[PDB]
Subunit: 293 residues, 6 copies
């Protein structure tokens, strides 16, 4: 607000210090997993949508992957669809998937498309179903020590890398809803964190960003001194069995992406307005960067 | 089934008689409004999806526009969302639109995309929201003689003709869900019959096809002798005030399309398996063809 | 004629059953050797020309190779050019070749070009001389057990695969007259059956079709029960020394093409109107299909 | 032969003086009517073919149009085909045209294609039949004062200007045999001099060259002092009714071409070895240049 | 330096507020006249070069025009070349131009090319001589009331708009030294301020920036309250006869550019580090903006 | 002058005998090192510039590399810049390089650009600094037996082969001034003879031409009978330690180029008007050709 009280010779140096990162990312793919409160608060949402327009007006190629777990389960309760739970996991019947698909693609992805498109004709929504852009393989879960079927849920199988980069080269910002047909054409819901890692690897992304609701990776949570800002995958992979259940899907995504050759994956604070801008164009990022090693 | 009892020298002549229509339509846009029982029965649905693959494997460029009125209203009742009705028209509150959008784009369009894509990576789903492909203008209705607001409902305003034909030239079959933002970015639901006419006109379509649940246009329904097979728009426009309420949106679409320069619009029997193939590649079509005059 | 007595729901299924073959052949090269009565009767000729237009208006890329042996020898007798015969083979003097070239390229190929072009600007005539599209190597013949020279006759040597596919990608239907210069620039006449096999192999054709004047391959001619509809090259190659002299050039072509990687070569009945359409788009073909093995 | 006795500092100036004409013609179409003794003598023929390769290896785009009247009539006599003559004009029956076509396209054009192609894959032969490259309109003749039908003979009607320049831009040297279908698809023989003028006008040629068997235009033949080297069309058009019957078709071609906007047409001595090179790259040409006025 | 003491949530808002100007300028030409102390101090120079890399890594297309008057005159004195002066203007003999050209193109432009190229292969130096990119017309000067010749000095005549935008579309940053041949090929030195206006108009630039050594346009210099930040050309054109001699060439450039259709020209403080960044991406610019009116 | 006294049938044969070399060089890169009296005399200069236009109007791609040693040293004396000399080599201080660069790029290259451009928009001047087209590596010299530093002088390091051929494919004639930055961005002066060899090798040139002030390579200078016209690199490499100091840089260039795969390098007499034309298009060249062996 009263940000015009800041001298203009510091506004300059802030912009000038973005240049090495503008160079690094010019012409490159950046996959961004969008979820958490950055998806539930209107100020953060509009900032996120603005940053995706920012990237695109810098000649950078963002790709957005979104989840929406809580919204699926609220729609299920509204429809009075009673759940079945093996372990702590709801079974995804054909009925639950139809709901998941409708909610993610026809509600959650729509709002991000319209927000982004307020800045131009950039956003385009899609699932693996569209133009056979990617496929799924059914995933089983292990629960208290036995692999068990929990329905139409899976992992990304193959990605139409060629068709996906045409879409980006045409200046579009794909907004991906993670549903995809298996080899027999039956559609599965895919965890959005792991989908983002698979997409970032298939597209040769320069960075994977994971918006989450924390400052960054704590090693010995909740010691404040335990927070790290850069970590290699070797050290990170062995720290995995210690962290909170909320953190593991995000860490596995970064591990799988960086092992797959994406140069860096980042876990950043989605509660921070314009967190994408601070992580990419500033050395004052709060997140933690994962590199190979 | 026992169709191999038919001599092979008649199978030949049937295929050979498709040639003048293969020539006429080669390289051209054909917009198809898909609704009715051709959308509710599984055999007709799979035939429709196969015919869209047929067109695309002939070098013809189909564009599918779909409705889904009954499915919206069934979802509203499941969600316990009570309706408001001026005249015979449900008012489209913000809540009703979110449902309409979710149902059309995230359920109805998905099934057509997967059906078509069983034959290849052809189908791609979209609304006017995606890449700002088209806009809407709010429409008012006249009811017992006064123009009245019934909420977020409208007509197609502008169409991104250039971007839409790139999508087609890339070999994609757009499957359009008729929702679109107005100039202030608020999304409206558009009647699918009128949307199909506006799309066919914007894209320079060679033909508009309207799948409906009748043999074709009867002039003096229900006289059987009153059924016509070709009609010019002058004669058709003045016959409009006489026909059943179900027929008027389909006739207005054909009028607006053919007046807009689309060479012919067709009202064809969606209860007939492969009705698209019979109308386009055979002289034995049941429908009625509308031409300028 | 009275083919409108056939119900329209069977006309539909006939067209729908073409779809798997439209998919297989979409975008692919199909080389067709045209000769026999399909070249001497006006109804079959006009049907053949229509089918080549059919293919081209499906986004399929046909390439026509033609012979014309009997027409050469009728022109030689009209010119009073007395023949020399080693074995049963006329020696091709410089004079005979000038006649062969003039007849094949300036009479026989012209009529097919005009027939096809009645449907559009598709056909283009050529020999190996044009744009150095292919070369010939002089061939010797063995006669009662000694290899002997019979003049300017040969086999296809090299093919300008790149230039030939540009011509096709521009939407043209090449009509090839099989004459071609050797390495010293002297033009040779090439047997059209073997030329078609060499072209199909060089162009990566999906199918080679050989129009002939028989139902298909009989193994123990004339046992009617001896007719086969599919045969692998291993079995076919050893059956070669048994068949009628008229059949061997067509079988050697299929062997050389399918061994060369063309997925299937077909021997089909050129006396059947629209035989090309029945073989490619129907499961009721009379011919015999050759596959690798 | 003993041309190495010429000092090398004059060989240099000869080449350097070609430069203004290399600039003028770089990237431009040059239509060359080839006939006369330049077509009957082997040394002149091989020189002509070399000059067409020269042009093409300078980035100039030649287009060759050829006649062959005497060869048609020799083939007719060999076939014992008796002629019918209204005025001094043989009637072109269907039979005569088949012969004319076979001779021009399948004998005369072939030899020029092979000669040129001795220098590279440049030449390609064609008629108006191929790819519908141009059409004909039947022409009547006036004889001792009455317009009379003399069969399948005509004038160039329309030219596929777009398709013809693609062929040239691909680096090909078209060798045109002047036969072309009318609007009903029946093929006509076209006078090669007038065909060359129509082609030069349709293609936007920079120059039309007419090889003939004379030094150039004499005004008062046979006064030697009457020979001219440049003439405008106004003066030339009124001199037309005076000249020898052999000269009029060549003068009418130049008139029609230059009036049609071709900047200059040239009548040059086809009995001179490399006459094309001397006319285009030297100021010592023997011919006569026609310009607008 | 101690700029990390600034909270990171203000670094964010500074970057976010660049977005409307990133959108406006994305894909557009921006011509920048570079001179003054921004060209003599090493910190400002390296900042200017960095900002040109910034623009180019945003998908913006900068074009640099430079002067260098003082460096020419220092080289003349080193060479002992005595000047001739009509009015207050040195006469540009052939000798002076050779020096001016050598200094501007071979010294001054080289240093900017190397500075910019420290960030990538972006800069390319040129004059109107290269690829005939622009021409000059000799200019006369009026001195104490009479138009007088002062040698090889002129104004930009024609600009090769097509070739100049190819160079930019290839990702290059032209660095222009303002020398150019007239119609007879004799090279003239052009005032860099007026050259920048002519280039900006020819290229359809979105903005012209004029780096100068002042805060901006004062109307009643030296009243501090007289400084303006936006002015239309009508008001500016009539204020021209009042201002200091140093300001008029910069004002005439802006007038001629904005009248010529460039949407805005800006006079900005070249003594400010990263003045280009502050003017284009911040609302805190010191300069004065000129718009049509 | 009186060159029209030469019969026109010999002017023809001179042009016709250029054809095999037009074919060989069509579409190919030819690098020409321009120096010596061909650079100091106005008639030879204008002839050289005309020949570069000749090549370009034949579809040949020339690349000009120039020196200018004597002009640098005359400018140094005018500026009163006293030299330092280790061995017989002037040390290149930062000051000397600024002069060398200004003279070569801003004087010597400019005149060749304008001369060439008198024939069209062909010439474009550049150094390794522009678009990072090539880099330098500092070179040391051995003097009376010890390697010694003589300042900012070096050899070509890497060449941006891709960017250089784009420039040529756009129809431009690069005129190269041999200055180039090392890896730390500090600019070095490169011997023009060795730069030409490195450029010819990087660009895949068909020929390297070296203009010099002698008839050609003498083996036992000054025996007149000792002059050779073709020599292989094996024989040439061992003859190197015998020849005059002026000849060695030119021989080393040819050795390094031909060993590097350039098919032939030529040492030709730059005192001969149109020496480029005589060497490339005539068998009467005075020079000596170097081939691999
Ligand atoms: Cl997938 C897909 N959806 C699109 C919408 C607009 C343009 C291109 C698209 N590709
Ligand atoms: Cl080869 C050949 N002949 C042609 C005729 C028309 C267009 C292209 C062609 N290529
Ligand atoms: Cl490097 C360089 N300089 C140029 C001038 C004109 C066109 C292209 C160019 N590339």
């Amino acid at each position: 607000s009263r940000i015009e009280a800041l001298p203009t010779h510091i506004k300059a140096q802030v912009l000038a210090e973005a240049l090495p990162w503008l160079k690094q990312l010019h012409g490159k793919v950046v996959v961004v997993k969008y979820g958490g409160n950055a998806m539930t608060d209107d100020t953060l949402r509009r900032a996120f949508a603005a940053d995706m327009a920012f990237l695109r007006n810098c000649g950078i190629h963002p790709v957005v992957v979104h989840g929406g777990g809580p919204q699926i389960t609220a729609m299920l309760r509204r429809l009075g669809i009673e759940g079945d739970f093996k372990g702590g996991f709801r079974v995804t019947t054909p009925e639950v998937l139809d709901v998941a698909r409708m909610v993610l693609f026809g509600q959650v992805g729509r709002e991000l498309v319209n927000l982004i498109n307020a800045h131009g004709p950039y956003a385009v929504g899609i699932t693996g179903e569209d133009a056979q852009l990617f496929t799924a393989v059914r995933r089983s879960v292990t629960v208290d020590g036995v692999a068990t079927d929990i329905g139409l849920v899976g992992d990304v199988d193959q990605v139409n890398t060629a068709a996906m980069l045409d879409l980006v080269a045409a200046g579009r910002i794909p907004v991906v809803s993670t549903l995809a047909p298996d080899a027999d054409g039956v559609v599965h819901n895919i965890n959005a964190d792991t989908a983002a890692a698979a997409v970032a690897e298939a597209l040769g992304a320069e960075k994977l960003l994971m918006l989450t609701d924390i400052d960054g990776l704590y090693t010995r949570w909740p010691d404040r001194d335990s927070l790290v800002s850069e970590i290699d995958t070797g050290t990170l992979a062995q720290l995995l069995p210690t962290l909170e259940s909320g953190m593991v899907p995000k860490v596995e995504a970064c591990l799988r992406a960086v092992i797959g050759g994406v140069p860096s994956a980042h876990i950043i604070d989605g509660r921070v307005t314009h967190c994408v801008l601070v992580e990419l164009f500033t050395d004052a990022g709060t997140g933690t960067k994962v590199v190979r090693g």
